[PDB]
């Protein structure tokens, strides 16, 4: 479900064709208003913990706007995610999973890695079953669990004067309207 939600927010860079019309509200707003060079969402997994969020690269006068729009998307998905965009995220994940397991090498990695982490190979038909179960209610539940009113870890490098203060990043993790 977190991966579905991350797919809805997606990725962007400056070489993506057609910016304005992209489905992701973040990617669309970032392209139109020249808010960044790139962003990526991620879900890095370790044993019993991980790092769930995003990274971006932008001009010095754009960090505030980027952070605002990113956080708004997290908040939107917690509170008011809808059926149609969740289908799009589901589809993006089926397409990512299948397109990744393509070649001897990524499949061999997946056999090797999966037996260390899950102790089985989880077959492709199981993932599809797990993807299919995800709807808007699941995205709202699962995003709220990890994102809503939680303390982020934040890392900043470069021209970062306009990087919002941590209290104001913390305040971006809930909504007063909800």
């Amino acid at each position: 479900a977190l991966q579905v939600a991350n797919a809805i927010i997606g990725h962007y860079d400056c070489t993506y064709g057609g910016g304005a019309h992209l489905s992701s509200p973040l990617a669309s707003i970032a392209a139109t208003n020249k808010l960044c060079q790139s962003f990526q969402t991620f879900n890095i997994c370790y044993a019993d913990t991980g790092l769930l969020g995003a990274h971006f690269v932008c001009d010095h006068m754009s960090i505030d706007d980027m952070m605002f729009v990113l956080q708004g998307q997290w908040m939107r998905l917690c509170t008011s995610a809808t059926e149609s965009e969740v289908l799009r995220g589901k589809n993006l994940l089926r397409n990512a999973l299948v397109s990744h397991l393509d070649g001897t090498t990524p499949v061999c990695e997946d056999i090797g890695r999966s037996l260390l982490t899950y102790g089985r190979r989880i077959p492709l038909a199981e993932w599809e079953s797990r993807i299919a179960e995800v709807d808007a209610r699941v995205v709202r539940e699962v995003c709220s669990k990890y994102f809503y009113d939680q303390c982020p870890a934040v890392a900043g490098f470069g021209p970062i004067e306009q990087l919002p203060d941590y209290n104001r990043i913390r305040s971006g993790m809930f909504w007063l309207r909800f």
Binding site: I29, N33, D65, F68, P164, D165, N167, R168, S171
Partner: protein
């Protein structure tokens, strides 16, 4: 793209109160600016609710104020909140000026010069306000302070009678003093905005007097919350005074109705005029005494021209620290003398304190700054 950032009205609020880069750094001495704003709206709000029941005629003015305090549902809190808020307004003013003097904040010429106008305007407003309940202190307060104009040669008499409405303080004097006292806080409010506009051009000074662009923090949430706490202390200080000692800072003589035939034996200003009062009466000359009074407050506008030091703040200037405190204690001395009768020890020590006030600012503090420069090989 933020609604907070681009909406033509919220823009103004955001660039003043939310996203405004402020020093990491500024102490409790920086709380008095917001506290003056709180004081301004407190006085506006209570003053409005007092205006709803006050009548500005000589026959009835004392009666209306006591009608407020006895008959009007909770008229007593409103009246004494107003009275003690005016004194709160002065405690905050004096702290705010002294902070500016100490920390070299006067180097913001326009902000400071507008501040000097704000001091004079709030002084004139509060003089008018005290005239309104038409007690004994009201009448002679109105007499003496209006008569200061009579020291302007050739035209001063015509001027005093021009603002009086006739040959003496009368029916005409009180009705216009209500009108002047009503509008002037709104004029003050407008000048407070221009004061803030000139300030935002530079942002704030800080305790070190060193530029703080290297370490700015957003006004919200840090100085929004520090300001709330500071205001809650202001409410304590105010509500201690209205609820436990409502008349501590006023005069009992203003509880007897005005009487044009008898000036009381004991008469002194409101506590916050006592230093300037002490300065004027230390001079046994009409023109010189009022010229010294004008100069005792208008001097603040010379302070930027007399800054000799290669540092802005007094934080790293011990000679100047000593002489600053000599200035505060001398001002405390002058308010003590203001409180006392014009008799033997008090005449001389008040004369010496007057001289010291002007000598400290004009001569002794500029020389301290040069010595301090020379000691740092500067």
């Amino acid at each position: 793209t933020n609604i907070r950032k681009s909406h033509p009205l919220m823009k103004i609020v955001n660039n003043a109160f939310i996203d405004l880069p402020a020093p990491s750094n500024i102490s409790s001495w920086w709380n008095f600016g917001s506290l003056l704003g709180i004081c301004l709206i407190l006085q506006i709000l209570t003053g409005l609710f007092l205006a709803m029941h006050y009548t500005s005629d000589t026959t009835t003015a004392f009666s209306s104020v006591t009608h407020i305090c006895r008959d009007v549902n909770y008229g007593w809190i409103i009246r004494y909140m107003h009275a003690n808020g005016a004194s709160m307004f002065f405690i905050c003013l004096y702290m705010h000026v002294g902070r500016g003097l100490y920390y070299g904040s006067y180097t913001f010429l326009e902000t400071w010069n507008i501040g000097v106008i704000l001091l004079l305007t709030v002084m004139a407003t509060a003089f008018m306000g005290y005239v309104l309940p038409w007690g004994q202190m009201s009448f002679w307060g109105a007499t003496v302070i209006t008569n200061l104009l009579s020291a302007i040669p050739y035209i001063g008499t015509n001027l005093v009678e021009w603002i009086w409405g006739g040959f003496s303080v009368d029916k005409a004097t009180l009705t216009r003093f209500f009108a002047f006292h009503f509008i002037l806080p709104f004029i003050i409010m407008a000048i407070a905005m221009v004061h803030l506009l000139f300030l935002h051009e530079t942002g704030s000074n800080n305790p070190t007097g060193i530029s703080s662009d290297v370490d700015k923090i957003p006004f919200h949430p840090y100085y929004t919350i520090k300001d709330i706490l500071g205001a809650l202390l202001l409410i304590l200080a105010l509500m201690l005074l209205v609820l436990f000692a409502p008349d501590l800072l006023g005069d009992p003589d203003n509880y007897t109705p005005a009487n044009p035939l008898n000036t009381p034996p004991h008469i002194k200003p409101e506590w916050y005029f006592l230093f300037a009062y002490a300065i004027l009466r230390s001079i046994p000359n009409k023109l010189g005494g009022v010229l010294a009074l004008a100069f005792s407050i208008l001097i603040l506008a010379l302070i930027p021209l007399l800054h000799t030091s290669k540092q802005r703040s007094m934080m790293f200037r011990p000679l100047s620290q000593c002489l600053f405190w000599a200035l505060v204690a001398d001002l405390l001395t002058l308010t003590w003398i203001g409180g006392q009768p014009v008799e033997h020890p008090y005449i001389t020590i008040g004369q010496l304190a007057s001289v010291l006030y002007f000598l400290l600012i004009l001569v002794l503090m500029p020389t301290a700054g040069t010595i301090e420069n020379k000691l740092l090989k500067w």
